[PDB]
């Protein structure tokens, strides 16, 4: 036939050629599966391989049972497995001392087995890729796309077996050795590996950043993936602030392998895209508060979505705080109630105050009797809302702007048994009462101030949504000031 007479002379690189060009007759099936048993002597037969291997796969018409089994004596469930798994593509750089010329990203396909493990590339020492089924306690079917040396490439074939969406594998590169216990084993030459990867713009994972294949797995497989959102005031901080945000995240037993550096490169992010700076709000400029606002919608869309690469929001953690407490107001009602996420208060450091990762409700749920607030009520149409959780008391001049505003109506919520300063613990009880309070006596028309931590404004605006006529007056140092943006327009809708 063609492929014989192509054999007969050794044209490997047309044989790959015609394969990519994918117009193949049936005829011809047998003489091109007879190449994978060929000895991989040199690079052009090992690259044939691979594109006759690619070719079956994704034109499942050409992949064939006979053949399968009668030319490459497969099993048959290995068989019925290489033609129904689906396969995992992964990209792992080497160096070659000698030939620098010949230095290359590769590619390895791998198909996960149930009780074999095998490939088709005749240079590769079988104990590697038992090392690679030890650790994974998975079999499988690996090929390679180029002829190398050594087995730098363990980390890579790991992560294809690991990771359940191959999505996350299309922009990240591996090198590094892997032990029968699922450790990461140091290997060489990782600035030339690094220039390799990013000439094919891709970012390397080397053993400086995972450590063992559990590790691995809290990135390529995560149950909850932590994200960072803070606001801050000062620039000169950001970069600080993120790496105390990572100390408070790794507090957590769930997210003890967290690493701000590995988030960033694993799902494509930068500083930038877990802080937004504010130098000076002017809360009575409504055009450049909806700039911020349009900046924190921008910025938390990125973060739950991720490109695609997550399938399940649910997925995701966001651990979240801000820096003034009427801004955070409006991010809370932009965030909405429905996102898995962890609520920070940062005094010297970040500490976690409302963990909404097992129930977003919680700051909603009304209680019969109020156990962290007292409330003194007189209810009337033009109702004025007073919040009292911090040091400072905003009551009097919260009773003085309700009589400026002519409002009849006051609810007054403070502390219960504490006076100023919240002292620092779960404070899902406290949102879910003051929740409570304002919807048990929300009017037609609300005024709103307060004085209490950032963290509870955040809270309050995820509990109470854009559904309340409320009117919010932002402390100016000195003085009340109407921030100008109702608390129920139609720009404040989540979009989460």
């Known amino acids: 036939g063609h492929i014989k007479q192509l054999l007969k002379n050794k044209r490997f690189e047309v044989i790959k050629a015609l394969v990519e060009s994918k117009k193949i007759k049936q005829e011809w099936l047998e003489d091109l599966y007879s190449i994978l048993l060929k000895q991989d002597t040199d690079v052009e037969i090992t690259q044939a391989k691979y594109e006759i291997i690619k070719l079956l796969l994704t034109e499942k018409k050409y992949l064939n049972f006979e053949l399968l089994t009668k030319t490459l004596n497969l099993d048959q469930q290995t068989a019925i497995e290489i033609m129904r798994n689906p396969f995992k593509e992964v990209y792992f750089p080497t160096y070659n001392i000698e030939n620098p010329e010949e230095s290359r990203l590769n590619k390895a396909l791998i198909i996960p087995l149930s009780n074999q493990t095998f490939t088709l590339n005749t240079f590769v020492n079988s104990q590697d890729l038992e090392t690679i089924k030890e650790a994974t306690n998975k079999n499988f079917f690996v090929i390679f796309d180029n002829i190398f040396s050594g087995k730098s490439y363990q980390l890579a074939v790991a992560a294809g077996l690991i990771a359940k969406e191959k999505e996350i594998l299309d922009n990240v590169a591996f090198t590094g050795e892997v032990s029968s216990n699922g450790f990461i084993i140091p290997v060489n030459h990782l600035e030339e590996k690094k220039?390799?990867?990013?000439?094919?713009?891709?970012?390397?994972?080397?053993?400086?950043?995972?450590?063992?294949?559990?590790?691995?797995?809290?990135?390529?497989?995560?149950?909850?993936?932590?994200?960072?959102?803070?606001?801050?005031?000062?620039?000169?901080?950001?970069?600080?602030?993120?790496?105390?945000?990572?100390?408070?995240?790794?507090?957590?037993?769930?997210?003890?392998?967290?690493?701000?550096?590995?988030?960033?490169?694993?799902?494509?992010?930068?500083?930038?895209?877990?802080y937004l700076i504010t130098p000076s709000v002017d809360f009575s400029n409504r055009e450049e508060l909806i700039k911020i606002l349009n900046e924190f919608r921008e910025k938390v869309s990125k973060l739950l979505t991720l490109e695609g690469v997550i399938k399940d929001h649910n997925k995701v953690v966001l651990n979240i705080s801000?820096?003034?407490?009427?801004?955070?107001?409006?991010?809370?009602?932009?965030?909405?109630?429905?996102?898995?996420?962890?609520?920070?208060?940062?005094?010297?450091?970040?500490?976690?105050?409302?963990?909404?990762?097992?129930?977003?409700?919680?700051?909603?749920?009304?209680?019969?009797?109020?156990?962290?607030?007292?409330?003194?009520?007189?209810?009337?149409?033009?109702?004025?809302?007073?919040?009292?959780?911090?040091?400072?008391?905003?009551?009097?001049?919260?009773?003085?702007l309700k009589e400026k505003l002519r409002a009849?109506?006051?609810?007054?919520?403070?502390?219960?048994?504490?006076?100023?300063?919240?002292?620092?613990?779960?404070?899902?009880?406290?949102?879910?009462?003051?929740?409570?309070?304002?919807?048990?006596?929300?009017?037609?028309?609300?005024?709103?101030?307060?004085?209490?931590?950032?963290?509870?404004?955040?809270?309050?605006?995820?509990?109470?949504?854009?559904?309340?006529?409320?009117?919010v007056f932002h402390y100016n140092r000195d003085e009340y000031i109407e921030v100008p943006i109702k608390l129920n327009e139609e720009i404040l809708r989540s979009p989460f």
């Open 195 to 274: 220039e390799i990867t990013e000439k094919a713009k891709k970012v390397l994972i080397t053993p400086e950043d995972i450590e063992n294949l559990e590790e691995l797995s809290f990135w390529l497989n995560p149950e909850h993936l932590p994200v960072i959102f803070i606001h801050i005031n000062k620039p000169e901080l950001a970069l600080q602030s993120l790496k105390q945000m990572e100390d408070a995240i790794k507090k957590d037993e769930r997210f003890k392998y967290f690493k701000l550096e590995n988030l960033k490169k694993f799902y494509r992010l930068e500083d930038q895209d877990m």
């Open 408 to 471: 009849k109506g006051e609810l007054i919520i403070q502390s219960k048994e504490h006076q100023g300063n919240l002292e620092i613990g779960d404070w899902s009880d406290i949102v879910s009462e003051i929740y409570t309070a304002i919807d048990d006596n929300k009017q037609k028309e609300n005024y709103m101030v307060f004085s209490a931590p950032v963290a509870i404004m955040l809270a309050l605006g995820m509990a109470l949504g854009y559904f309340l006529p409320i009117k």
């Open 322 to 400: 801000a820096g003034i407490s009427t801004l955070a107001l409006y991010f809370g009602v932009i965030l909405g109630n429905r996102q898995a996420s962890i609520i920070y208060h940062y005094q010297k450091e970040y500490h976690k105050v409302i963990d909404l990762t097992d129930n977003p409700r919680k700051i909603k749920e009304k209680k019969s009797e109020f156990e962290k607030i007292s409330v003194n009520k007189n209810i009337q149409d033009p109702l004025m809302i007073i919040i009292y959780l911090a040091s400072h008391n905003p009551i009097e001049k919260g009773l003085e």
